[PDB]
Design an enzyme around this catalytic site. Structure first.
Site, PDB file in Angstrom:
ATOM      1  N   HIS A  25       1.325   4.910  -3.017  1.00  0.00           N
ATOM      2  CA  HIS A  25       1.550   6.296  -2.573  1.00  0.00           C
ATOM      3  C   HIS A  25       2.951   6.828  -2.861  1.00  0.00           C
ATOM      4  CE1 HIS A  25      -2.284   6.983  -0.221  1.00  0.00           C
ATOM      5  NE2 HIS A  25      -2.298   5.672  -0.273  1.00  0.00           N
TER       6      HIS A  25
ATOM      7  N   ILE B 185      -6.841   8.508  -1.610  1.00  0.00           N
ATOM      8  CA  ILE B 185      -7.098   8.321  -0.186  1.00  0.00           C
ATOM      9  C   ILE B 185      -6.119   7.224   0.289  1.00  0.00           C
ATOM     10  CG2 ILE B 185      -8.896   6.526  -0.542  1.00  0.00           C
ATOM     11  CD1 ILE B 185      -8.561   9.324   2.208  1.00  0.00           C
TER      12      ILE B 185
ATOM     13  N   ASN C 142      -6.434  -1.064  -1.288  1.00  0.00           N
ATOM     14  CA  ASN C 142      -6.947  -0.031  -0.378  1.00  0.00           C
ATOM     15  C   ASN C 142      -8.376  -0.270   0.070  1.00  0.00           C
ATOM     16  OD1 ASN C 142      -6.528   2.909   0.698  1.00  0.00           O
ATOM     17  ND2 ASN C 142      -8.503   2.952  -0.244  1.00  0.00           N
TER      18      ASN C 142
ATOM     19  N   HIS D 222      -3.835   0.214  -6.670  1.00  0.00           N
ATOM     20  CA  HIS D 222      -4.183   0.891  -5.435  1.00  0.00           C
ATOM     21  C   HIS D 222      -5.604   0.527  -4.989  1.00  0.00           C
ATOM     22  CE1 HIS D 222      -5.865   4.272  -3.044  1.00  0.00           C
ATOM     23  NE2 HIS D 222      -4.764   4.054  -2.320  1.00  0.00           N
TER      24      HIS D 222
ATOM     25  N   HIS E 115       0.830  -1.195   0.000  1.00  0.00           N
ATOM     26  CA  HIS E 115       0.000   0.000   0.000  1.00  0.00           C
ATOM     27  C   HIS E 115       0.885   1.274   0.000  1.00  0.00           C
ATOM     28  CE1 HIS E 115      -3.816   2.155   1.740  1.00  0.00           C
ATOM     29  NE2 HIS E 115      -3.471   2.601   0.543  1.00  0.00           N
TER      30      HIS E 115
HETATM   31 FE   LIG Z   1      -4.351   4.540  -0.146  1.00  0.00          FE
END
Ligand SMILES: [Fe+2]
Length: 820
Positions: free
Chosen positions: A485, A820, A675, A671, A480
């Site tokens: 990110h 997010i 997520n 992602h 993650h």
């Molecule tokens: Fe995320």
């Protein structure tokens, strides 16, 4: 004589109208086809907003339309850009300009601050798409000057209204001026700690350490990266700071004053959280109840109760998480479905130095395993043996983690067998510890096998928990944080620094960056900082982020492509007779099978879009913006890995397609898959523990007797304590929620993002294909033959790669970006 125009904007109190008239706001058109004596497009007169257009029926919430008329002879040519100055004190959000009589459109979506705050005037281009050799001559210098403005000069403290993209290392996480205990290693820029770069903020050094960046109340992002929202409930990224700074201390006081039990006593005390709720002090509810975003996480009586939502994993069966079937199934259809590997020899091997850690031979014996009647040679040869291997990853950190108060872990390995019915079953867990000469601990490594009765069943349930603590930590920090990110941000920064807003590849990639720099900056401040959320709720504590640097040493860009990932992990083989070019070794592997569909749809889209702008390989070689972009992304953004031989060179059509496909895949489907299952699977702390606090007990101790007499308490004493559970459930609830203003794969925020009709037609085809794929995935979930892997005993259809979703905590939907 005059060109009729319409300006659409949003006053700041949305993300009265008469104040925008008079001499408040001026626009100047810029010619794309007629130039001055220096080759620069001719600029018109300063022109002010004339009045409010109330005649359009169409406007979105919070938007207002203004009339304007430009003096412009045919001799001035065709407008291709405009300047704007705001003479009002307060910034506004500029949406668009439209010029009529055929129509010329400008998509802006940008904050415009007071004119005195800017060192050069804001400029916006019409929605035409050009590679650099196709830029109309009168726009060439304006195009390049705008890129120079975006790059800045590498110095200075960044301010709220700045639009300056540049790189820095992760030197802003520690807080050494508050305490030496909060000092952290700089991540990036050394052999010891390689790391992706992040966006430069420029606050300057701490007083105690010249290599660490001082604290600040606001972590800067370039202005238009900081997304406003019409509804405050959609500002999900602000929830982590409120959680760390306001809610966490309030929870702590309820525990310090002994107003709630300190520990969970039984599994029912955990289930209670989403049933009747938890009772807390009045002043603690009153702190939590009125905060935006936070107030949506819990239902309340307004006086003492907080109630969490019921997690998807328990909606049909509250006990199915404990089955061996569900433990294995979540490795191919859970929150973290991308770590399992094929195992083609037995016993499994280690590459770590036995001089440091002691003999690294596996002590799992083939003859102890139940492979449904298969011999080990038969299981290996038929490609039925798999593993979840955390031994080499965790072993280098076990000693230091285990020296912490209240952390104890093992370096785990799980062996899996693919049954003839096509489901996975777990057959052994190895719980390993390092050993060296003078060690003070008498704890030893051990192998645990499946059991359904007696103390052996409790030991096996605890072995599964130690594996899932390793998995939780690897998921959060590596699958993650690092791989989505952190890996993506260098490409965001390079794109704005080197590809003009006019460029076709800017238009292709930028939707896939929405909110990523913003959520990353908020994460550096409250999620991955010293004493922040991850350090205070996950096993490795102050070692958490540096572990992700160690893993980054073996991050490979081209292995992020889904087919290459599946082949590298030994879960698929190359097969050119198949539509995707790979043959899955687990036929019903929901993440991989669904993923290949999405991968192929993105690939068709990129392969149709690229040739619209590049006819041959040498057109790619000769695009100077593209060449500067890719050189910088590699040599600066991911610069600690610049010495590696595997980076694509970017001299062919094939290489451009490949680089763009991988970027879009990472940002969207990869992602989403890692997520949006976080609260649906992890909202029950026993299913996804974040931490372990003790090793297995020795026979003849009170702790051993507790495994026999009170197994649920033995479990709960081992995993994450109640207080960090409350905090960590709250954060994964926020991160699993879709904001109602999300933009999904197959959607764009504006229908006029380019004037090129062939590009628009290709994008329509891409969206229709994603709808066709969703229909197919629905038929897979409704196929009773696939129930075992797609639904499991938790009866939870695998919908994480469905392209579409409504708002909320939905367990489906693929955003364009890491939002997010
Ligand atoms: Fe995320």
């Amino acid at each position: 004589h005059k060109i009729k125009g319409t300006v659409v904007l949003m006053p700041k109190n949305e993300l009265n109208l008469n104040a925008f008239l008079g001499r408040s706001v001026s626009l100047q058109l810029i010619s794309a086809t007629k130039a001055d004596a220096h080759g620069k497009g001719k600029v018109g007169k300063d022109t002010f907003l004339e009045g409010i257009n109330t005649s359009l029926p169409t406007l979105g919430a919070g938007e207002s339309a203004f009339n304007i008329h430009f003096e412009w002879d045919g001799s001035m040519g065709i407008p291709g850009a405009f300047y704007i100055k705001n003479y009002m004190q307060v910034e506004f959000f500029l949406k668009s300009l439209t010029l009529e009589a055929g129509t010329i459109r400008f998509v802006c979506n940008s904050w415009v601050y007071n004119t005195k705050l800017y060192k050069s005037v804001r400029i916006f281009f019409a929605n035409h798409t050009y590679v650099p050799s196709e830029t109309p001559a009168p726009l060439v210098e304006y195009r390049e000057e705008e890129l120079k403005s975006l790059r800045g000069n590498g110095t200075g403290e960044r301010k709220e209204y700045d639009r300056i993209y540049d790189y820095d290392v992760y030197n802003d996480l520690g807080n050494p001026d508050k305490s030496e205990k909060l000092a952290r290693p700089v991540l990036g820029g050394s052999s010891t700690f390689p790391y992706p770069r992040r966006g430069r903020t420029g606050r300057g050094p701490t007083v105690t350490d010249p290599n660490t960046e001082k604290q600040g109340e606001v972590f800067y992002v370039p202005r238009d990266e900081n997304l406003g929202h019409l509804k405050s409930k959609d500002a999900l990224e602000i929830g982590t700071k409120s959680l760390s700074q306001i809610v966490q201390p309030a929870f702590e006081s309820a525990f310090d004053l002994k107003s709630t039990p300190i520990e969970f006593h039984s599994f029912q005390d955990v289930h209670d959280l989403y049933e009747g709720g938890i009772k807390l002090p009045r002043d603690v509810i009153s702190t939590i109840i009125p905060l935006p975003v936070i107030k949506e996480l819990y239902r309340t009586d307004g006086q003492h109760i907080l109630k969490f939502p019921q997690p998807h994993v328990v909606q049909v069966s509250q006990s199915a998480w404990m089955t061996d079937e569900e433990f294995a199934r979540e490795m191919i259809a859970g929150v973290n479905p991308c770590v399992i590997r094929g195992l083609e020899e037995f016993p499994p091997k280690s590459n770590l130095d036995p001089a440091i850690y002691g003999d690294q031979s596996s002590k799992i014996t083939a003859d102890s395993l139940d492979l449904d009647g298969y011999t080990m040679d038969e299981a290996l040869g038929s490609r039925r043996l798999f593993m979840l291997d955390y031994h080499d990853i965790f072993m280098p950190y076990v000693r230091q983690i285990n020296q912490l108060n209240s952390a104890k872990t093992y370096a785990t390995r799980t062996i899996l067998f693919l049954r003839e019915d096509g489901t996975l079953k777990p057959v052994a867990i190895e719980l390993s510890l390092p050993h060296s000469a003078g060690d003070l601990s008498a704890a030893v490594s051990q192998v645990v096998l499946p059991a359904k009765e007696g103390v052996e069943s409790t030991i096996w349930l605890l072995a599964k928990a130690y594996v899932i603590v390793n998995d939780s930590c690897y998921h959060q920090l590596m699958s993650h944080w690092l791989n989505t990110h952190a890996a993506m941000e260098p490409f965001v920064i390079a794109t704005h620094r080197h590809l003009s807003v006019l460029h076709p590849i800017y238009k292709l990639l930028t939707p896939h960056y929405r909110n990523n720099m913003n959520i990353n900056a908020l994460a550096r401040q409250s999620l991955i900082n010293a004493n922040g959320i991850i350090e205070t709720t996950f096993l490795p504590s102050k070692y958490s982020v540096e572990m992700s640097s160690a893993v980054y040493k073996n991050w490979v860009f081209t292995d992020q492509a889904l087919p290459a990932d599946l082949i590298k992990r030994g879960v698929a083989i190359k097969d050119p007779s198949t539509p995707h070019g790979v043959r899955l070794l687990i036929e019903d592997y929901p993440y991989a099978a669904d993923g290949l569909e999405i991968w192929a749809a993105i690939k068709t889209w990129v392969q149709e879009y690229v040739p619209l702008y590049y006819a041959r390989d040498d057109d790619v070689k000769n695009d100077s913006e593209l060449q500067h972009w890719w050189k910088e992304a590699v040599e600066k953004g991911h610069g600690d890995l610049k010495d590696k031989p595997w980076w694509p060179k970017l001299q062919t059509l094939e290489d451009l397609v490949e680089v763009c496909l991988i970027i879009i895949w990472i940002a969207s489907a990869l992602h989403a898959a890692v997520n949006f299952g976080q609260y649906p699977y992890g909202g029950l702390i026993m299913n996804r523990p974040t931490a372990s606090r003790r090793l297995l007990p020795e026979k003849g101790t009170p702790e051993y007797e507790e495994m026999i007499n009170n197994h649920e308490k033995a479990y709960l004493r081992t995993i994450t304590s109640k207080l960090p559970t409350l905090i960590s459930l709250s954060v994964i609830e926020i991160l699993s929620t879709h904001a109602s203003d999300e933009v999904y794969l197959g959607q764009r925020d504006n229908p006029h993002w380019t004037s090129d009709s062939k590009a628009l037609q290709a994008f329509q085809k891409f969206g229709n294909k994603l709808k066709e794929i969703e229909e197919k995935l629905v038929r897979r979930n409704n196929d009773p033959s696939l129930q075992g892997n797609r639904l499991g005993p938790v009866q939870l259809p695998y919908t994480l790669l469905y392209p579409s979703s409504e708002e909320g905590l939905t367990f489906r939907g693929i955003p364009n970006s890491i939002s997010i």
